[PDB]
Amino acid sequence: PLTPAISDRICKHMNEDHASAIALYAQVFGQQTDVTMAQMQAIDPTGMDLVVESEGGSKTIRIEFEQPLKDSEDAHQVLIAMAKQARSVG
Amino acid sequence: PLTPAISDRICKHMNEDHASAIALYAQVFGQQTDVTMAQMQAIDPTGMDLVVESEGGSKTIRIEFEQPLKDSEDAHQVLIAMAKQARSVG
Ligand code: HEM
Ligand SMILES: [Zn+2]
Ligand SMILES: [Zn+2]
């Protein structure tokens, strides 16, 4: 499952240890320009809430997933997936 | 800090949810050909012990890491690096 508790633990590691991915997400899937920083406010089964510093200045964007997340691994799989595709284009 | 408890938790997750990689490591860093499948047995700070099925026979190899692992996060970062570098090998 994906509960707010499960969300925060994700956004703690993601922000602490995988920050360059959060930026690549805002850049490719968030349609931001010259992203200096991005952090995950929340992750739910339908999308994640990013706080991005990008062209025009700091903002909150919502990235919607193509499909709902059934479990937590779904979230692992999407964050590996989005990283790969976001690296493929640029 | 990697305790045989944390090795079992990483190895089980790797084994049930990311086997395509375990096989990539065994291929590229384990110098294995026609890798039917592979499994993570254990991960200690100096390397991982892997069960890689060659065609008609099972071998136990160890991938020593090119730099010691401090903690679990270092453990994630290398499983991530080695995946990236294994796919490049093409
Ligand atoms: C012990 C539990 C975990 C294991 C064994 C694990 C393993 C991996 C592996 C093997 C990859 C490479 C994927 C591939 O190339 O196919 C990966 C990527 C990733 N993982 Fe984990 N992971 C774990 C927990 C987490 C958690 C808790 C988060 C976030 C909250 C996370 C976030 C990511 C991200 C964002 C990627 C893509 C990173 C990139 O492109 O650099 N992982 N993980
Ligand atoms: Zn996973
Ligand atoms: Zn990590």
Numbering used by the authors:
A (entry chain A), B (entry chain B): 4 to 93
Text lifted from the article:
Using a phylogenomics-based approach and complementary structural techniques, we identify a family of dimeric hemoproteins comprising a domain of unknown function DUF2470. The heme iron is axially coordinated by two zinc-bound histidine residues, forming a distinct two-fold symmetric zinc-histidine-iron-histidine-zinc site. Together with structure-guided in vitro and in vivo experiments, we further demonstrate the existence of a functional link between heme binding by Dri1 (Domain related to iron 1, formerly ssr1698) and post-translational regulation of succinate dehydrogenase in the cyanobacterium Synechocystis, suggesting an iron-dependent regulatory link between photosynthesis and respiration. Given the ubiquity of proteins containing homologous domains and connections to heme metabolism across eukaryotes and prokaryotes, we propose that DRI (Domain Related to Iron; formerly DUF2470) functions at the molecular level as a heme-dependent regulatory domain. We heterologously expressed and purified the recombinant protein encoded by the Synechocystis gene dri1 (formerly known as ssr1698) and tested the heme-binding ability of this small, soluble protein (96 amino acids, 10 kDa).
